[PDB]
Structure 1
């Protein structure tokens, strides 16, 4: 848990403090950033671990020390100090679990898609839109339906939705993946628990900085004679333009009309169109290569979250939580699942 992670951070702090005084390292800036993280973490760690060790010692020694009353009063004072130290350790964990980075402040795109069992997925994906809308209206987030493909017996097959504000992606990072469904559904007559799955993609903003300059100082413009037919004038004059980019290597050849300025206009518009095509193709490949890594095949396999409905259990594969509610979870209030994953993900 966090105690096994804090010890490795304290050992890395004690190693970096010894390596800093050895004076054998030329580069020191990354070592100074590591020492800054060490001064942020290991001081509160050495406070909280020593306070918890002294509290556990003063409790376990005075609990069975021949049933004394003065040792019991000393253990009560140590328990008050233990409550103060536990509040200080919770404040230190809340300070260490803070999203300082400005990439966490960005908006997001949620893509809830159906997996196994279409009818079940539709019921489930519509309820997950309901689940994150309930979650989103609690903190006052804006929910806009960008695209929603309907199912058969209700729900939706694919939902792509923008959520805007201040800090959507940094709070909803850990939701890309699969979701189990164990339910007794409304579409099933028999009444046997079934397994259904749904896949959720979480995408960041990535704001469009499009249309770089054409850079006529970087354009190589070759004005040479044209091939073909038509007149004496074509032979005398060039009437053909080839423009090549230096940083991308895009070549556009125009031999269309008589005047070169109509040809100049086409030989710049095709450059702009091919720049826009080659940049939007790379952007759509960068979207797809991340979506195929976040969204799996869609099967019933374990992908980080398992939800149990007839037993009353919510068990995730990372940070094995055992919350037996399923009623304060179905109507917003997803703090207890999301927060400790952040707390022991920012420990690394």
Structure 2
């Protein structure tokens, strides 16, 4: 499965209105091969279409069919918000991120946990001077200690020092996963500007050129309702070339 996510680039009104019409294109493509498409979030534009539309597509090998659409898509047409009638060039950017499911974020294995019970500091009287009532727990494979020294009994210090320990293994993992989301998305989502990045869509000539495998399909009605079979297929051939 995959996350198809189309952010609009240059031409912030027009390419919003066009990112509507890439989302309808792969929308028309996923309905052809019978895949579930679902708009998880959609920031609408000003005059139609979207500034970003991240929509999970599930199905049967969605990622290998659609991993080649990440990058820019430069759009030559006369716009809708054009009262002088000249050509304007814009761009949309697409990313395709794979499914990547979840596993249990803490392994709460207390055989890894060095439980350090020591004497409390602060106030208490003769109780502080003698009872320990303070606990460091050290998750050894991660090196995250947390010291809970809150209450008089050490048990309600220890259960707290296992709750906050579990939440810090959980948040310190979720920053690795969430760190690697935008680490890869930035590399795939281009700079947004029209320097050609992985296709064109040239409506006055009627032509489509994917820069790699310099295809020169003149279709543009056989592309704008799915039917990009001839678009993708030589790319997967010259991707199984390596």
Q: TM-score range by the shorter chain?
A: over 0.9
Shift of 1:147: 0.3
Paired residue secondary structure (1:118): coil
Paired residue secondary structure (1:297): coil
Greater RCO (CA < 8 Å, at least 6 residues apart): 2
Corresponding residue number in structure 1 for 2:24: 130
Corresponding residue number in structure 2 for 1:41: none
CA contact (8 A) 2:10 2:92 kept: yes
Paired residue secondary structure (2:159): helix
Paired residue secondary structure (1:134): helix
**Please, which moves more after superposition, 203-212 or 110-119?**
203-212
Distance in 2 separating the partners of 1:308 and 1:234: 79
TM-score w.r.t. length of structure 1: 0.69
Shift of 1:296: 1.5
Shift of 1:231: 2.0
Shift of 1:327: 1.0
Which of the two has greater strand per residue? 2
- Aligned residue runs from structure 1 range 146-161, under 5 A: 146-161=40-55
Shift of 1:227: 1.0
Distance in 2 separating the partners of 1:210 and 1:158: 31
Which of the two has greater helix per residue? 1
Corresponding residue number in structure 1 for 2:64: 170
Shift of 1:211: 2.4
Paired residue secondary structure (2:150): coil
Q: What value does the CA root-mean-square deviation take over the aligned residues?
A: 0.8
Deviations 1:211-252 (A, max 9, x none): 232111110000000111122011111010001111000000
Distance in 2 separating the partners of 1:326 and 1:117: 21
Deviations 1:286-324 (A, max 9, x none): 111100100122101111111111001001110111111
Distance in 1 separating the partners of 2:218 and 2:8: 26
Deviations 1:51-80 (A, max 9, x none): xxxxxxxxxxxxxxxxxxxxxxxxxxxxxx
Distance in 1 separating the partners of 2:2 and 2:25: 16
Corresponding residue number in structure 2 for 1:291: 185
Structure 2 unaligned segments of length 5 or more: list them: none
Return structure 1 stretches of 4+ with deviation > 6 angstroms: none
- Aligned residue runs from structure 1 range 198-213, under 5 A: 198-213=92-107
Shift of 1:201: 0.4
Structure 1 unaligned segments of length 5 or more: list them: 1-106
